[PDB]
Design a protein around this nucleic acid. Structure first.
Lengths: 214, 213
DNA sequence: CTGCCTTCAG
């Protein structure tokens, strides 16, 4: 059973380098080339290059020459990719992909991916703001100004799960923002309480914000 | 260099439908075309290599055909787990290049969005900020446009949008649109409007509030 | 310079 275990997620500073790993098992590591592929959030797939672990020979996408360095270690059946001079443009998920018994064959087995985030931001807890209206009632909370991802949002400590939309975070000058909406019967609020619970594990922070009428 | 032109960028279908994704090549690439599936939040998986050969495990409802410049991936009668993205990729030397992808999404009945607007909170305003939030929830199909107006003037600066993926249960899409201003900027205007344009009505859904109200 | 070959095999 072919398995490629990738090293964990990387938060790295602009200008720095990062080296990630791909440990292979379930086949003869040296018999197949190993590819690397870039995928930015919500975008397509970009081939970086491959290494032949049998002879250490590399083939690159010209765009990544000088940016990506592919190496392998037969002893540990591990392929590595080092990325240098990091910019925000390098933030992406990176995969190792087992290639062919001949290098020009199709790549088959993909690793779980390694997420790289390039930022100079410091760990920052969210500010959480209630969104109260100015028959179903929609409420929300705005989770602004945090780093790094993720935050987890629940409502009424998880008691409220239907009618919830928690949206992908986006960057606002290198901090993240997200919102979550919950839609409930008018009979249930403000009569009864609705509270959004935001956890930001990275800063060991919990925020509980009651939505009150204006 | 080899360029893979996939179409359609998105295709809407139903379970038990037969769909065909096309992939064209800048030059002839013989039989050397591969197909990958990628489901939201997951690594890709190989479906087909050498134009027509299924990879190990791949169900026989997937089939690939073609040669030269023109290729296709047929999924004979879609199953619930088949919705996701599909990429072609040539394996005819280097550099390797992928098609831009076809996103296969699940057909449902049209739904107008449920639109909701929220003024800045007192908490935010105390800190010198003012974000106006518009939720456009459970619409279908995906294509939508939000426009902000401030005192009837259109506003594009300070706006950040986020969209969810097609929901797995109900097959709708949702969107948040957030206009962020400073308290000072916010307090120069009265009327804030979130206006949504969608297939389900020629007239856009308009939600507004007045600050001085 | 950096070739040739397209799936159980140098």
């Amino acid at each position: 059973q072919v398995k490629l275990l990738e090293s964990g997620p990387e938060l790295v500073k602009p200008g720095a380098s990062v080296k990630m790993s791909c440990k292979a098992s379930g086949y003869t590591f040296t018999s197949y080339v190993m590819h690397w592929v870039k995928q930015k959030p919500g975008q397509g797939l970009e081939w970086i290059g491959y290494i032949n672990p049998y002879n250490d020979g590399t083939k690159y996408n010209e765009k990544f020459k000088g940016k990506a360095t592919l190496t392998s270690d037969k002893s540990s059946s591990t392929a590595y990719m080092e990325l240098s001079s990091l910019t925000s443009e390098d933030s992406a998920v990176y995969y190792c992909v087992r290639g062919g018994y001949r290098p020009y064959y199709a790549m088959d087995y993909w690793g779980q991916g390694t997420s790289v985030t390039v930022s100079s931001a410091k760990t920052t807890p969210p500010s959480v703001y209630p969104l109260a209206p100015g028959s179903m009632v929609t409420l929300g909370c705005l989770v602004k100004g945090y780093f790094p991802e993720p935050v987890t949002v629940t409502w009424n400590s998880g008691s409220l799960s239907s009618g919830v939309h928690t949206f992908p975070a986006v960057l606002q000058s290198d901090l993240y923002t997200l919102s979550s909406s919950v839609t409930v019967p008018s009979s249930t609020w403000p009569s009864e309480t609705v509270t959004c619970n935001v956890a930001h594990p990275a800063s060991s922070t919990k925020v509980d914000k009651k939505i009150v009428p204006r | 260099e080899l360029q893979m032109t996939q179409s359609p960028a998105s295709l809407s279908a139903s379970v038990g439908e037969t769909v065909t994704i096309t992939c064209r090549a800048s030059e002839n690439i013989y039989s050397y075309l591969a197909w990958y599936q990628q489901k939201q939040g997951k690594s890709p998986q190989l479906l087909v290599y050498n134009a027509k050969t299924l990879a190990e495990g791949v169900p026989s409802r997937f089939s690939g055909s073609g040669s030269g410049t023109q290729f296709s991936l047929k999924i004979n009668s879609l199953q619930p787990e088949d919705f996701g993205s599909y990429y072609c990729q040539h394996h005819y030397g280097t550099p390797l290049t992928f098609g831009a992808g076809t996103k296969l999404e699940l057909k449902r009945a049209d739904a107008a969005p449920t639109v909701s607007i929220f003024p800045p909170s007192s908490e935010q305003l105390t800190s010198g900020g003012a974000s106006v939030v518009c939720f456009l929830n459970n619409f279908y199909p995906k294509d939508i446009n939000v426009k902000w107006k401030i005192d009837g003037s259109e506003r594009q600066n300070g706006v950040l949008n986020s969209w969810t993926d097609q929901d797995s249960k109900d097959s709708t899409y949702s969107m948040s649109s957030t206009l962020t201003l400073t308290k000072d900027e916010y307090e120069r205007h009265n009327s804030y409007t979130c206006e949504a344009t969608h297939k389900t009505s020629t007239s856009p859904i308009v939600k507004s509030f007045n600050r001085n109200e």
